Amino acid sequence: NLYFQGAMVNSILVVCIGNICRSPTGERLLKAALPERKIASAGLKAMVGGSADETASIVANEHGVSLQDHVAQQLTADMCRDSDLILVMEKKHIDLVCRINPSVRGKTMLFGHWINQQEIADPYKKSRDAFEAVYGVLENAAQKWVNALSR
Amino acid sequence: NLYFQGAMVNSILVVCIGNICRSPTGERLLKAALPERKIASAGLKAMVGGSADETASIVANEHGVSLQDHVAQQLTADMCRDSDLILVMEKKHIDLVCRINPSVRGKTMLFGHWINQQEIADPYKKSRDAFEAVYGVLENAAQKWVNALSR
């Protein structure tokens, strides 16, 4: 059972831009840890219908995580309202979420909130090494969220 | 040695409104843990010259923390620039700090960032029980900051 800010967390929405790289990876890391919770992802300007990035998928698979059957979707105001916690990769993205739904700033947090560096870099179209580095950061960040929500 | 967000933290500034209650308590909890670091506090509209609140002092003393020789001071833009980390008690206070110095949003965080509830209530002029409860929250929050900065 998960809690944050004096409320239950039943659903988590991971948000980035395209909904093909960091966000499906973050989603699936959380789902692996939280099989009974509703975990999804969406993009601020999504490649609607797209599957997970090939390199993101390769790297995740190497670490035992599947990005299979991901379908990229556009973030809507309704998704924001319905989610109990919204996680973004970079600080600038918080304002972007709040433009879609101004009422959710209070529950919009960094994916990397519980790690020292806070923000998580964008590996899209970068080297394999960038994807591996980012995966490790997301894995650590996701575990630290699970610990925080459940302790 | 302390770090946050890819930088050293040598100085921490704890900010609230009057600079007589939560903020001197938070300051002195951090100082007790971090004797070699520069730790101070300031108020968004301070009771300039005031000592720590009597009830805040009593409660802190019971837990082995001294608020002696506190002198309340007004937050300035220079203090904001000079501090490596600025900690506020409530989310609404972040924008208030940024009105004094717009360039410091990136290093302005909740005192309760590392605890589940995030925000820390205002005990000023409330019951002894409110001060005791808030002290415990601040103590936990401060320890979790020290752990995060140093691990």
Task: List CB contacts (< 8 A) between B6 and chain A.
Answer: 117
Task: List CB contacts (< 8 A) between A114 and chain B.
Answer: 114
A88: containing domain: 1-151
CB contact under 8 A, B116 and A4: yes
Breaks in chain A follow which residues, C to N over 2.5 Å?
Answer: none
**110-139 in A: which are within 8 Å (CB) of B?**
113-114, 116-119
Mutation choice for B interface testing from A116, A118, A144, A147 by most B CBs within 10 A: A116
What is the distance between the alpha carbons of residues B90 and B94, in angstroms, rounded to a whole number?
A: 8
DSSP A51: P
Nearest residue to A26 (alpha-carbon basis) of A18, A35, A14? A14
Q: What are phi and psi of A118, to 5 degrees?
A: 70, -60
Q: Reduced to 3 states, what is the DSSP secondary structure of residue A108? A: strand
Query: B128-150 and B22-33 are packed helices; what angle lies between their axes, rounded to 10 degrees?
Result: 40
In this structure, the strands spanning A7-8 and A3-4 are antiparallel
- Residue B145 host element (H or E): helix B128-150
Residue B146 carries which side chain, given as an amino acid letter? V
User: Hey, what's the torsion of the CAs at A28, A32, A38, A44, to 10 degrees?
Assistant: -20
Q: How was this structure determined?
A: X-ray
Provide the domain count of chain B.
1
Residue A20 carries which side chain, given as an amino acid letter? I
Q: Reduced to 3 states, what is the DSSP secondary structure of residue B100? A: helix
For residue B119, the domain's CATH number is 3.40.50.2300
Resolution of the PDB structure in angstroms: 1.6
